[PDB]
Design a protein around this nucleic acid. Sequence first.
RNA 1: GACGGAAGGGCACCACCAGGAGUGGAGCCUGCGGCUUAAUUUGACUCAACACGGGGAAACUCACCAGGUCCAGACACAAUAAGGAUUGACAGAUUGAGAGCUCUUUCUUGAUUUUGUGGGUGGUGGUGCAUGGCCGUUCUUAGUUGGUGGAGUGAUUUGUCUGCUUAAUUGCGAUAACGAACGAGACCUUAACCUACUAAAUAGUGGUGCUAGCAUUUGCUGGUUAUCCACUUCUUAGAGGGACUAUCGGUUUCAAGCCGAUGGAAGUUUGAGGCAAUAACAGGUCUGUGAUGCCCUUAGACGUUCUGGGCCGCACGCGCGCUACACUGACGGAGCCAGCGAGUCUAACCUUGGCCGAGAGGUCUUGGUAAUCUUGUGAAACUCCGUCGUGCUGGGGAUAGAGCAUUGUAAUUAUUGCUCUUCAACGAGGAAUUCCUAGUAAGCGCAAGUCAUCAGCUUGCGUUGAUUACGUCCCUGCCCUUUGUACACA
Lengths: 63, 223, 96, 107
Amino acid sequence: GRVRTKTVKRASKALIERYYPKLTLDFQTNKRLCDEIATIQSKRLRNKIAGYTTHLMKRIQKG
Amino acid sequence: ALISKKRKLVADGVFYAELNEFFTRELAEEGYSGVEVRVTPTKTEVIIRATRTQDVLGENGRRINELTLLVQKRFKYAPGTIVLYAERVQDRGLSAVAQAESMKFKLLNGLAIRRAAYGVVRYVMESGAKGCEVVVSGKLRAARAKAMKFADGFLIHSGQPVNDFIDTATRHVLMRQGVLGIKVKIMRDPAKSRTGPKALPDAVTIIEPKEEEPILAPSVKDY
Amino acid sequence: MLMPKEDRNKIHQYLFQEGVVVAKKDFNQAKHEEIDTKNLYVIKALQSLTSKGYVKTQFSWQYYYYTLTEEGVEYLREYLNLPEHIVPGTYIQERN
Amino acid sequence: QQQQIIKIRITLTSTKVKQLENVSSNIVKNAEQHNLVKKGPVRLPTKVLKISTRKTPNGEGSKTWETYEMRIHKRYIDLEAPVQIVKRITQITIEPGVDVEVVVASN
RNA sequence: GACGGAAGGGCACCACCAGGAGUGGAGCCUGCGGCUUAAUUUGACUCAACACGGGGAAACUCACCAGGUCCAGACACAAUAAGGAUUGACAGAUUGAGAGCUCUUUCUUGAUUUUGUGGGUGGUGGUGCAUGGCCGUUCUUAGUUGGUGGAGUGAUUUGUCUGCUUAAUUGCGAUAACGAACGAGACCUUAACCUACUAAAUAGUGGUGCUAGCAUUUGCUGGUUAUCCACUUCUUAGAGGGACUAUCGGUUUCAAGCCGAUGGAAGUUUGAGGCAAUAACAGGUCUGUGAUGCCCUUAGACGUUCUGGGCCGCACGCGCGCUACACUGACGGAGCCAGCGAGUCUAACCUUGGCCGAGAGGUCUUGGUAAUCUUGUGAAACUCCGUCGUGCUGGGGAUAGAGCAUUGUAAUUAUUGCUCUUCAACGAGGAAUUCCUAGUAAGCGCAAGUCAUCAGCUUGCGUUGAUUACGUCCCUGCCCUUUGUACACA
C-alpha cells in the first residue's frame, strides 16, 4: 500500500542520465554510489532514491 | 536570589519579551528589528538595530535618558549598568516590519488597497521572495464582508522547516471607522540568506563528468 | 485629590535626579520602591499636566510610563523653580 | 594561592545544543594548551520542560491541547582547573546568553 | 455550480458485520434548563452548546440580589474660597466597619480648584448581523492551479482520463495535449539498535584503601556522609551509520502490484505523533486584551470600598462521570513496582527522620533553587499463605449525629480528613445509543493544571496486557463521472 512518490521519481532522470553504465544488481555499493557527490538533504530521502535506483534497473533484465 | 537552572531561560522573556513588547508599542516608529542579546554582567546591551538609528545621539540626553531608565526601571534593575547603542538596519525586503512600517504612515491618506502593496515587496520579489501573503482588513467599506485577500508571488511552500524563510507581522490603527488590521507574511530566501542549507530540498544541482573512457590502446608512461 | 504638594514635589524631586515618574498597580499598598508615596493618588496630579502635554503616555502591563516631554522647562520654572539644563532638554549622561 | 590543579566542578548549560557543545569543546581544547589532568566531559542528560494547555481564546468546538517548551541543555563537566582559565570566559566561547560561575572545589 | 425519496463509482469502527470496553438502572458529585426568589449575572443550544470558557469558584474572583464612604470629576473654556474653600473628627444617638454611614457638633483646615457650561470615556455595559487579531468547522480529505497550445462568438472548458493500484489526483497506462507550482505525499520527531567513539559519581560500573560476619564449599553479604577513587558500555547523545516496503517462489496489462518465507533493532506511510493548501462560514471570542466604530453612562459609577445569599436555593427534564450488585471475590499476614515532575528568595515550598499521642497530626531535626534532598515515589492494581458463605452480605456506604485535628484576619448555608453513631438503596439495568483494531484495545494507580485548603475532573506519566473484523454499502456521513433542475440570503 506504499507505492513511491513523484519528486524522487523525476529527480533520477536528471541524475541517472549522468551515470547509466553502473548500478548493478547487488544493492550495496551502488547505494552509496547513488549517494556519491550530490547535494542531498537527508539520508533516507536518498536511500529511497537508491532503492528507486535498485528496483528500477534490476528489472531491465526482465526484458 | 541564588538563581536556579529553571529561573532564567524560561524567564528569558521577563527581559527579552519586555523589550519586544516595549518597542512594539512605545516608539515602534523606528522599525524595530531585534536586539543583539549578549548580556555581559553589570552592563546592559541595548542594540536597537532599526531604521532610524540617527536617534541614538539625538539631543544626547532628551529621550535616551528616559530609555536608559524605563525598561531598566520597571522591573527595577539597579542603575549603573545601562548602555545604549544602535546601527542602521538594511536589506529591507527580508523583514516583515520593513514593509509593515512602510504602510503605518499610509493608512490615513486614502491610497489604494493594492498599489503600495505589491510595489514595495518587489524589492525582494526579484531578489528572493517566492510566495507571500498579504491581507489588509478591518472595515474599509461598510458592508457585510470586509476583507481583501490579496494574493501574490511564485508560490513555494511547504516543506515543514518553515521558519528558515518566513516573516510575520500584524498591525492595527484606530481610525475614524474602527480598527484597520494589517497582517502580512513576507517570505525570505534560503538562497539569498547564504546560511546552512542552500535551499530546502528542491534546488539540487547535478554536475557533469569527463567523457567516459574508450578501449584505450594504452601507454608507455614512466615519470 | 486635594492634597498638599510637598507630597508631589518629593516625587518631582525624584524625577529630575535621574529621569523617572512611574507608578505601580495596587490600592491601599502605598509602597512603591524609590517612589515611596502612595501608589494611586499620585496619579491625580500626574494627568493634571497631561491634558496640556508636558509628559508622555502608555499603559501596557499597567506600568505607568508617564515621563516628561521637551516642554519640561517652563512649568518647572514655577513648580520646582529650577535653573534648566540639569534635567531639561539637554541632560547629557556623559556622551551616550 | 594561584595555579594549582585541585579537582573543580565546572558547570555549563545553554538552550540549543549546537552552541553548548561549542563552548565545552574550545574549553577542553583549551584544556590542551597546558594539559589539565582530567577525567573530563560528562555527557549529562538534557531536559524537557513541558506545558500542556488549551491555546483557544474561547470555550467552544472540538477543544485543543498543545505543548510549548524550552530545551534546557546542560553539561556539567568534571574539570580539574587552575586559576588562569576562569578569567577570560565572559567574552570567550561566545553565544547569545553565556552564563557561567563555578565553585572552586569538588571534594 | 447546489440538490434529488436519480443512477453509477468508491471509501468510512466520528455507521455497520466479528468483536473489547460498553452507556443511559440506583445513589451522588458536575453542568445546562426551567421552578421562582428579592437573586439564581452572563455567553455557547446541530456531530459543529452542556467536567466548556482553567470553571477542584469562602473572602481575592463575581458582571445578579443587599446596604453604606473614594470620586479615583484629565480637563479644551470659566461663576463660588483669604474677618475662610475641602471636609477627617474625639466621646456619644444611630451605626456589620469609632460607617463623623447619618447626626449631637466646634476642634482641624489654605492655595493643595469644591467645581462651573461642557468634556476624561471607568464599565465583567449592548453591539462577533461594527470588528480586527485569534480559535473551530466545511474535510481524520484529496483537493487546488497558473504558463502555453486545442474546441466554443462568449461565459468557459481541455490539461485533472472509460482502465487498474494506493494511505492517497500516488503511479503505471491511455492520450489535443505538453511540461509543471502547490497542498498531500514528501518531510521530521519519538520508546528506540551503535558495549565504535570527543566522555565521566550532583550521575552508573569488575575491583575492594579500612576488610565486620555467616562459611571455610577460598571469595561471598558487605559497608566504608570520599581512601587511592579502578573504568565508560548500562545513565546521558556531538554528529553519523545501520533500512532502503530487504530477499527469492506465487499471481500481475509484466509495470503500478502485494503476499508464503526470512537476515535483521527497525518490513504496517517502522507504531503513533507534529506543522497541515484555494475558497469561505453573518460558526464563535466586544464577561481575556486599557484595540475597539456607535450608544447607555460618564460620578448619584453600569468603576470603586467592605460583609452576607449566589454561580452551591427544588416536582421535574436532558449532558460527562464516580462506588457497585462480591465469592480468579473480601479480610488478615509475607514479598514488592514506575515515570512525570515541581519544589522555598529574602521567604518558609518539597521533606526522609527524632520524640509524642490510636489516627488526624504536632515540636527539634534530613537534604534540596535542585541527576545533591523529596524519592529507590517498595503506592494501588500485583505474586504467595491463613479467615469469611446464596444475604442486600467480612459487596456496598447513599442518609443524617456526636467528638478530635488541619488550612485560612476570617470555615455558618458545613475547606478537607480522622474516630465512632446512621448502615440504606442497587441486584447486570426500558421504543433511547457511543468509542476503539498491539505494549495499542483493556486493568488499576501517581505527578502536573487550576493548587492556603477543596478532585468523584482533565492532561500526561506510567505498572500489568487480550480480541476479532481482517473489511463494506441497506441505515448515517463525505468526494468523483453522467444526466434533470422554473434554485442562486442555492
